[PDB]
Amino acid sequence: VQVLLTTIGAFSAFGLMTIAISTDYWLYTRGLTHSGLWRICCLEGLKRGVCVKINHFAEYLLRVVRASSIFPILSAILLLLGGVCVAASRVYKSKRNIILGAGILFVAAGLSNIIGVIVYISANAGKNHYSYGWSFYFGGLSFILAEVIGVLAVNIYIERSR
Amino acid sequence: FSKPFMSLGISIMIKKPQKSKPGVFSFLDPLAYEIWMCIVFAYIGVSVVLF
Ligand SMILES: Oc1nc2ccc(-c3c(Cl)cccc3OC(F)(F)F)cc2[nH]1
Numbered sequence: 001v002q003v004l005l006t007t008i009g010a011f012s013a014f015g016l017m018t019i020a021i022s023t024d025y026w027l028y029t030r031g032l033t034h035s036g037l038w039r040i041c042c043l044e045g046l047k048r049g050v051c052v053k054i055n056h057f058a059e060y061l062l063r064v065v066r067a068s069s070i071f072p073i074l075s076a077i078l079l080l081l082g083g084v085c086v087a088a089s090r091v092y093k094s095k096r097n098i099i100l101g102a103g104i105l106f107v108a109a110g111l112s113n114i115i116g117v118i119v120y121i122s123a124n125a126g127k128n129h130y131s132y133g134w135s136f137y138f139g140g141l142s143f144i145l146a147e148v149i150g151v152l153a154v155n156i157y158i159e160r161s162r
Numbered sequence: 163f164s165k166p167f168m169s170l171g172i173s174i175m176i177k178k179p180q181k182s183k184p185g186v187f188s189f190l191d192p193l194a195y196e197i198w199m200c201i202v203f204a205y206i207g208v209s210v211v212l213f
Pocket residue numbers: 020072113114116117118121136137138139140141142143195196197199200203
C-alpha cells in the first residue's frame with residue numbers, strides 16, 4: 001500500500017512544482033499588474049497587453065538569488081532525483097538501502113523550497129495592497145506533499161529492516 | 163448696538179474619533195501574516211527532519 005503511495009506522490013509533487021514556477025501568476029499588485037517569478041506581465045498599464053522581463057539591476061548576494069531562482073528550482077531537481085530512487089524498488093530489488101537515499105532527497109527539497117520563498121518575500125518588499133495569486137499557493141503544496149512523501153519513504157525503510 | 167446677549171469665537175471643528183473597536187485577531191499584529199505562516203511551515207519542516 002505505502003510502496004505505491006510514494007511513486008504517485010513524486011509525480012504529483014514534481015509535476016505540480018514545475019507548474020508553480022512556470023506560470024507567472026504569483027503576486028497581484030497595483031494599474032493591476034499580476035507578478036511572477038522571472039518576469040511580470042503588466043495589465044492596465046496604458047497598454048492592452050504588455051509583458052516585459054523584470055530588471056534586478058554585501059546585499060548583492062540576495063539580488064542574484066532572486067533573479068536566478070535556483071532554490072524554487074533545486075526543489076524540483078531533488079523531487080525527480082528522489083522520484084527515480086523509489087522507482088528502483090522493482091529493478092535491482094532486495095537492496096533494502098536505496099529507499100533511504102530517497103527519504104533524504106524528499107526532505108532536502110523541502111528545505112530548499114521554504115528557502116525559495118524567504119528569498120522571494122524579503123526581495124518583494126525590498127498603502128500598496130498586494131495579494132498572493134492561485135499560482136503561488138501551488139508552491140505551498142510542493143512542500144506539504146514533500147513532507148508526507150518524506151515520512152512515507154523512510155517508514156518503509158524501517159519496516160524493511162525490521 | 164445693545165449689550166452682547168451671547169459671546170462666541172472662532173472655534174475648531176475636527177472629525178470625532180470613533181471607538182475604533184479592535185479586530186478579533188488584533189493580537190496577531192506585532193508579527194506579519196508572512197511571519198506566522200513561515201513559522202508554521204518551519205515548524206512542520208523541523209519536525210519531519212527531527213523524525
Ligand atoms: O514554492 C513555495 N513553497 C511554499 C511554501 C509555503 C507557501 C505559503 C502558503 Cl502555502 C500559504 C501562506 C503563505 C505561504 O508562504 C509564506 F512564506 F509562508 F508566506 C508558499 C510556497 N511557495
